[PDB]
Structures are given as C-alpha cells and as structure tokens.
Design a protein around this motif. Structure first.
Motif, mmCIF file in Angstrom:
data_model
loop_
_atom_site.group_PDB
_atom_site.id
_atom_site.type_symbol
_atom_site.label_atom_id
_atom_site.label_comp_id
_atom_site.label_asym_id
_atom_site.label_seq_id
_atom_site.Cartn_x
_atom_site.Cartn_y
_atom_site.Cartn_z
ATOM 1 N N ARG A 2 34.896 46.059 31.667
ATOM 2 C CA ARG A 2 34.510 45.675 30.335
ATOM 3 C C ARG A 2 35.702 45.538 29.386
ATOM 4 N NH1 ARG A 2 31.872 50.720 29.041
ATOM 5 N NH2 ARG A 2 29.997 49.717 29.753
ATOM 6 N N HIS A 3 36.532 46.568 29.283
ATOM 7 C CA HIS A 3 37.601 46.547 28.304
ATOM 8 C C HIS A 3 38.535 45.405 28.591
ATOM 9 C CE1 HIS A 3 36.188 50.264 26.801
ATOM 10 N NE2 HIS A 3 36.944 51.090 27.497
ATOM 11 N N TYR A 4 38.901 45.260 29.863
ATOM 12 C CA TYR A 4 39.795 44.174 30.258
ATOM 13 C C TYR A 4 39.150 42.863 29.910
ATOM 14 C CZ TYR A 4 42.875 40.974 33.180
ATOM 15 O OH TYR A 4 43.644 39.899 33.610
ATOM 16 N N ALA A 5 37.854 42.740 30.251
ATOM 17 C CA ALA A 5 37.105 41.507 30.045
ATOM 18 C C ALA A 5 37.181 41.144 28.557
ATOM 19 C CB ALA A 5 35.660 41.632 30.537
ATOM 20 N N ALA A 6 37.036 42.144 27.657
ATOM 21 C CA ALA A 6 37.240 41.959 26.202
ATOM 22 C C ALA A 6 38.625 41.367 25.902
ATOM 23 C CB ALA A 6 37.058 43.262 25.466
ATOM 24 N N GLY A 7 39.628 41.883 26.615
ATOM 25 C CA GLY A 7 41.033 41.449 26.524
ATOM 26 C C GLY A 7 42.010 42.602 26.268
ATOM 27 N N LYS A 8 41.501 43.839 26.286
ATOM 28 C CA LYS A 8 42.336 45.035 26.226
ATOM 29 C C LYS A 8 43.248 45.032 27.421
ATOM 30 C CE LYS A 8 41.285 50.070 26.624
ATOM 31 N NZ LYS A 8 42.418 50.895 26.087
ATOM 32 N N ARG A 9 44.553 45.193 27.175
ATOM 33 C CA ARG A 9 45.565 45.085 28.262
ATOM 34 C C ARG A 9 46.366 46.344 28.576
ATOM 35 N NH1 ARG A 9 43.002 42.044 29.499
ATOM 36 N NH2 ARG A 9 43.218 39.888 30.243
ATOM 37 N N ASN A 10 46.487 47.233 27.603
ATOM 38 C CA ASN A 10 47.129 48.489 27.887
ATOM 39 C C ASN A 10 46.197 49.488 28.558
ATOM 40 O OD1 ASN A 10 48.233 51.072 27.866
ATOM 41 N ND2 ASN A 10 49.226 50.706 25.919
ATOM 42 N N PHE A 11 46.537 49.930 29.785
ATOM 43 C CA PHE A 11 45.822 50.998 30.581
ATOM 44 C C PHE A 11 46.774 52.057 31.189
ATOM 45 C CE2 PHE A 11 41.638 49.157 30.541
ATOM 46 C CZ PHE A 11 41.885 47.799 30.292
ATOM 47 N N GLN A 12 47.858 52.312 30.476
ATOM 48 C CA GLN A 12 48.879 53.128 31.056
ATOM 49 C C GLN A 12 48.486 54.594 31.013
ATOM 50 O OE1 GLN A 12 52.668 52.452 29.401
ATOM 51 N NE2 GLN A 12 52.132 53.033 27.340
ATOM 52 N N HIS A 13 48.927 55.329 32.028
ATOM 53 C CA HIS A 13 48.605 56.730 32.273
ATOM 54 C C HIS A 13 47.172 56.989 32.551
ATOM 55 C CE1 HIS A 13 52.552 57.582 30.435
ATOM 56 N NE2 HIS A 13 52.483 58.691 31.152
ATOM 57 N N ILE A 14 46.363 55.961 32.706
ATOM 58 C CA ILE A 14 44.973 56.196 32.982
ATOM 59 C C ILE A 14 44.870 56.810 34.380
ATOM 60 C CG2 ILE A 14 42.686 55.128 33.208
ATOM 61 C CD1 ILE A 14 43.529 55.351 30.304
ATOM 62 N N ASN A 15 43.939 57.741 34.522
ATOM 63 C CA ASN A 15 43.610 58.342 35.814
ATOM 64 C C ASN A 15 42.515 57.573 36.534
ATOM 65 O OD1 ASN A 15 42.258 59.936 37.852
ATOM 66 N ND2 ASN A 15 43.106 61.723 36.886
ATOM 67 N N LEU A 16 42.826 56.845 37.589
ATOM 68 C CA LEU A 16 41.794 56.073 38.286
ATOM 69 C C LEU A 16 41.716 56.513 39.730
ATOM 70 C CD1 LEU A 16 43.240 53.197 36.299
ATOM 71 C CD2 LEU A 16 40.725 53.831 36.200
ATOM 72 N N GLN A 17 42.019 57.780 39.939
ATOM 73 C CA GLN A 17 42.162 58.306 41.248
ATOM 74 C C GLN A 17 40.907 58.064 42.033
ATOM 75 O OE1 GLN A 17 42.932 62.449 41.362
ATOM 76 N NE2 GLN A 17 44.250 62.119 43.151
ATOM 77 N N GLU A 18 41.024 57.552 43.255
ATOM 78 C CA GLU A 18 39.868 57.324 44.166
ATOM 79 C C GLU A 18 38.851 56.236 43.719
ATOM 80 O OE1 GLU A 18 39.542 59.676 47.121
ATOM 81 O OE2 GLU A 18 39.455 61.664 46.202
ATOM 82 N N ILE A 19 39.176 55.540 42.634
ATOM 83 C CA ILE A 19 38.289 54.563 42.059
ATOM 84 C C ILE A 19 37.986 53.423 43.049
ATOM 85 C CG2 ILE A 19 39.988 52.947 41.088
ATOM 86 C CD1 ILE A 19 38.211 53.235 38.451
ATOM 87 N N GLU A 20 36.742 52.954 43.034
ATOM 88 C CA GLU A 20 36.370 51.769 43.757
ATOM 89 C C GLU A 20 36.609 50.642 42.830
ATOM 90 O OE1 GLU A 20 35.648 51.511 46.814
ATOM 91 O OE2 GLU A 20 35.714 53.699 46.929
ATOM 92 N N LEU A 21 37.615 49.824 43.104
ATOM 93 C CA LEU A 21 37.859 48.624 42.301
ATOM 94 C C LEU A 21 38.052 47.365 43.146
ATOM 95 C CD1 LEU A 21 39.823 49.508 39.037
ATOM 96 C CD2 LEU A 21 37.709 48.406 39.272
ATOM 97 N N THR A 22 37.321 47.321 44.244
ATOM 98 C CA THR A 22 37.511 46.244 45.160
ATOM 99 C C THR A 22 37.187 45.011 44.375
ATOM 100 O OG1 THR A 22 36.774 47.821 46.759
ATOM 101 C CG2 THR A 22 37.148 45.574 47.556
ATOM 102 N N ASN A 23 37.942 43.948 44.667
ATOM 103 C CA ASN A 23 37.691 42.557 44.176
ATOM 104 C C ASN A 23 38.074 42.350 42.727
ATOM 105 O OD1 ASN A 23 36.663 41.745 46.720
ATOM 106 N ND2 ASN A 23 34.573 42.457 46.239
ATOM 107 N N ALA A 24 38.408 43.457 42.063
ATOM 108 C CA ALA A 24 38.564 43.516 40.612
ATOM 109 C C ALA A 24 39.737 42.693 40.099
ATOM 110 C CB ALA A 24 38.742 44.954 40.171
ATOM 111 N N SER A 25 39.482 41.891 39.072
ATOM 112 C CA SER A 25 40.429 40.827 38.674
ATOM 113 C C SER A 25 41.337 41.111 37.411
ATOM 114 C CB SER A 25 39.595 39.544 38.512
ATOM 115 O OG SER A 25 40.371 38.402 38.768
#
Lengths: 233, 233
Positions: B8-31
C-alpha cells in the motif's frame, strides 16, 4: 702400382703404402688392416667390403670411392677427402674423421659410434638411418644433410651447423647442441629428451615438434618456447 | 510492518523504508523499484521474483533470503549481508555489490554483467553457470567458490583470491588476473585466451590445462610454463 703387387707386398708384411697412386683400382674384398695409405690417391676407387681396420688414410684422396660396407674401425682419416664417396653400410666405429671432407657422401645406415668428426664437412651428405651414438661432431658442417631416423644419442654437436638438416624422426637424446644452428631443420618426431640446447639457434616450430623431456634451456629459450605456444610477452 | 501495509505505502508512492524489520516476510512477486531499504532486516525473507531495480539495500540484512529470480538491475547492495541467500537465476546487471557478503550463496545461473563486486566476499558460493561478463571482482574472496562453466569474459579479477576455486570449463577470456591467487583451482578446459596473467600465483598444472592463446606473461612465468612442460633449467 696394381693389385696383385700390392696384395702380395702386404701379404709379405710390407705396411708402408703412402702416396701410392691407386686411382680407380679394383680392390674389392681386399684385406688391409694396419696399412699406411696416407696421401694415397684413390679417386673413383673400388674398396667395397675392404677391411681397413686401424688403417692410416689421413689426407688420402678418396673422392668418389666405393667403400660400401668397408671396415674402417679405428681408421685414421683425419683430413681425408671423401667428397661423393659411397659409404652405405660401412663401419667406422672409433674412426678419426677430424677436418675430413664428407660432402655429398652416401652414409646411409653406416656406423660411426664414437667416431671423431670434429670440424668435418658433411654438407649435403645422406646419413638417412646411420648410427653416431656418442660421436664427436663438435663444429661439423651439416648444411642440408639428410638424417631421417639417424641415431646421435649422446653426440657432441656443439656449435655444429644444422642449417636445413633433415632431422625428421632423428634421435638426439642427451646430445649436446649448445650453440648449434638449427634454422630450417625438419624436426617432426625428432627426439631431444635430455639434450642440451642452451644457446642453440632454433626455429620456434622446433619448440612445438621435438620431444623435449628434460632438455636444457636458457631463459631466452624459456621465453621463446612460451611464445611459440602463443603466450603474449 | 507487514505486507499489505508496505505494498500500500509504496503503491501510494512512499519510497523511504530504511531500517524497517521485514524479517521472514512473504513478499514474493512484489514490485519495488527505486525503494530505499538500507539497514532493513530481511533474514530468511521471501522475495522470490521481486522487482528491486535501482533499489537501495546497502547494509541490509539479507542473510538466508530467497531472492531466486529477483530483478536487482542497478541495485545498491554495497555491504549488504547475503550469507546463504538463494539467488539462483537472479538478475543483478550493473548492481553494486562492493564489500558485500556472498559467502555460501546460491548464484547458480544468475546475471552479474558489469556488476561491481570489488572486495566482496564470495567464499564457498555456488556460481555454477552464472554470467559476469565485464564484472569487477578486483580483490574479491573466491576461496573455494564453484564456477563450472561461468562466464567472466573480460572481468577484473585483479588480486582476487581463487584459492581452490572450481574453474572447470570456466570462461576467462581477456579477464584480468594480474596478481590473482589460483593455487588449487581446477582449470580443466578453462579458457584464458587473451587473459592477463602477470604476477598471478598459479599451479603448474594450469600451464598444461588452460587455453592460453594470447594470454600475457612475466618472464618468471615463461619459465614456469617451460618447466611445467618438462624442460630443465
């Protein structure tokens, strides 16, 4: 002098025959060991099968003589003139041939084990199949000689001229080639294992053709070799 | 943070995601092109097929992530931690991987055309079949990496560690190996034509195995080469 004379005198035990003119003489089979024939004239002579062991022939004119199959073991032929002589299958083991003239001579299958050919002239001779195991050819001229399958296992070819020699399938194992010239020689299947090559002039082709297992080299030579295999330095 | 958030956030156009914890996340196919994920935690994450073109991942924890088939074209992975990551068939053309950690990583059939791997750690990685045409591995560690049939046509391996690499059937044409170490590498059918070898440490076996047409050498090397062919100096 003629034959029945000379056979007779020798048979008596007369040993000096120097400067005798025996030009064109038929002496086939004639048995003449220890004879002194130095300066003797034997142009186009026939001494096929003649036994001349330990004979002294130094400066003898033997140009164009048939000597096919003669025994010359231990004979002194220093400076004897053998241009165009037929020596096919002759045995010259231990023979002194230093400074001798062997241009154009037929030496096919002859034996020169340990013969001294220092500074001898063998330009254009046919030595196809001959044996020179341990012979001295230090400084010999072999401009254009044919040595297909000849055995120089262990010969001194220090500084010899091998310009344009046929060495196809020759045996050069532990021979000394230091400072020899082998520009133009055919070295197909020739074998120079353990041979000493240092300072010899070679074509690069030689690096690709001759078996060189244990052959000795310069650094200049190492490089040559590398580059003959296509490495860029 | 989780997936439906971040998509969602990216889709909005938010581009900063630094230091985010996405450990073990399922993000297959994600653009996720142009995303800033530096210092982000992605241990054992699933980003299979994820599109990360021009993404910033520098110092991101990617140890043990599935990235099989991801687009990483032009991504910044300087110092990103990729120990044990699955990158089989991923595309990293033009990617910055300097000082990055790639030990034990699965890179089978991946594309690193012109990627910057300066000083990167690739000890024990599987690069069987990959492509690195024009890549920079100046000073990389490849202690024990597997490079069966990999293409480093034109890569800088200046001073790289190839200790015990598998290079069987590798392509090294016009690569730079100046000062590389290739002690223990398997070089069966490897091809180093036009490669620059000067000052590299090699086993002699290499001289006998690698095609070296136009490869550049030292004099020390010329000699090596000669002697590896059995010449005595």
């Amino acid at each position: 002098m003629n034959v029945g004379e000379i056979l007779r005198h020798y048979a008596a035990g007369k040993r000096n025959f120097q400067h005798i003119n025996l030009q064109e003489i038929e002496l086939t089979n004639a048995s003449l060991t220890g004879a002194d024939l130095s300066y003797a004239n034997l142009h186009h002579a026939n001494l096929s099968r003649a036994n001349l062991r330990s004979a002294d022939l130094r400066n003898a004119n033997l140009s164009h003589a048939n000597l096919s199959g003669a025994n010359l073991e231990e004979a002194n032929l220093e400076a004897a003139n053998l241009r165009g002589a037929d020596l096919h299958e002759a045995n010259l083991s231990g023979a002194d041939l230093q400074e001798a003239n062997l241009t154009q001579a037929n030496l096919k299958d002859a034996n020169l084990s340990d013969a001294n050919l220092e500074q001898a002239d063998l330009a254009g001779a046919d030595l196809q199949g001959a044996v020179l195991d341990g012979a001295n050819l230090h400084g010999a001229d072999l401009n254009g000689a044919d040595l297909k399958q000849a055995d120089l296992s262990g010969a001194d070819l220090g500084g010899a001229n091998l310009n344009n020699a046929n060495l196809s399938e020759a045996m050069l194992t532990r021979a000394n080639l230091e400072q020899a010239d082998l520009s133009g020689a055919r070295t197909t299947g020739a074998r120079l294992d353990d041979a000493d090559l240092r300072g010899a002039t070679v074509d690069p082709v030689l690096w690709r053709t001759a078996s060189l297992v244990g052959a000795r080299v310069d650094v200049d030579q190492a490089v040559a070799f590398a580059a003959a295999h296509g490495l860029c330095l």
